[PDB]
Amino acid sequence: RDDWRCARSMHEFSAKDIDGHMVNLDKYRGFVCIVTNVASQXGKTEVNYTQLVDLHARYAECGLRILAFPCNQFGKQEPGSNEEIKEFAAGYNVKFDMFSKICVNGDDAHPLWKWMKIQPKGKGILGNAIKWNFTKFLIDKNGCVVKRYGPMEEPLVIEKDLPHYFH
Ligand SMILES: [Cl-]
Ligand SMILES: [Cl-]
């Protein structure tokens, strides 16, 4: 239903993918997901893309999925078009799911991001707003937020928190 104020799961939202196609996020029902805001011109771009690609390579077979949302709200570090961003991600051998560029803060924020930020495990250390590029949310198979990791936490720190069976 796309209403951040009433939704109980990620699975109630839709989002436009980087190719311009609407995706119902209920396709992720049953899968553990990392949802993250990305940028191409951030100091931590390289380590985030490389480690997200590595996590996906090793855990896709267990059901790990990664949803990457480009966002230009942090130092204008995602200025390119969706087609440019798709090409950029392809240079990292990204095989996870790239979305069209969004806002993550303010009234124009994508509803999924409004929702994630208010979940009990979606709070940041110093409040809910997304602070910079490459915040990550871990989402369980039921579409609930389990943990949040900030811009300074490289993606491999999430590895520890994946289900034991993955390992
Ligand atoms: Cl996948
Ligand atoms: Cl914070």
Residue numbers in the entry: 5 to 171
Q: Which text from the study accompanies this structure?
A:
The isoform GPX4 belongs to a subfamily of selenium-containing GPX enzymes and is unique in that it can also reduce hydroperoxides in complex lipids such as phospho­lipids, cholesterol and cholesteryl ester hydroperoxides, even when they are inserted into biomembranes or lipoproteins. This was later extended by a conserved asparagine to form a catalytic tetrad, which in human GPX4 consists of Sec46, Gln81, Trp136 and Asn137. Recently, GPX4 has been identified as a key player in ferroptosis, a non-apoptotic cell death resulting from the iron-dependent accumulation of lipid reactive-oxygen species.
The protein was purified and crystallized, and the crystal structure of the wild-type form of GPX4 was determined at 1.0 Å resolution. The structure was solved by molecular replacement. In the refined structure, the active-site selenocysteine residue Sec46 was clearly defined in the electron-density map, but the difference density maps showed a strong peak at the Se atom. At the very high resolution obtained here, many side chains needed to be modeled in alternative conformations. Additionally, one of the histidine residues of the C-terminal hexahistidine tag could be built in the electron-density maps. The apo wild-type GPX4 structure described here is very similar to previously reported mutant GPX4 structures.
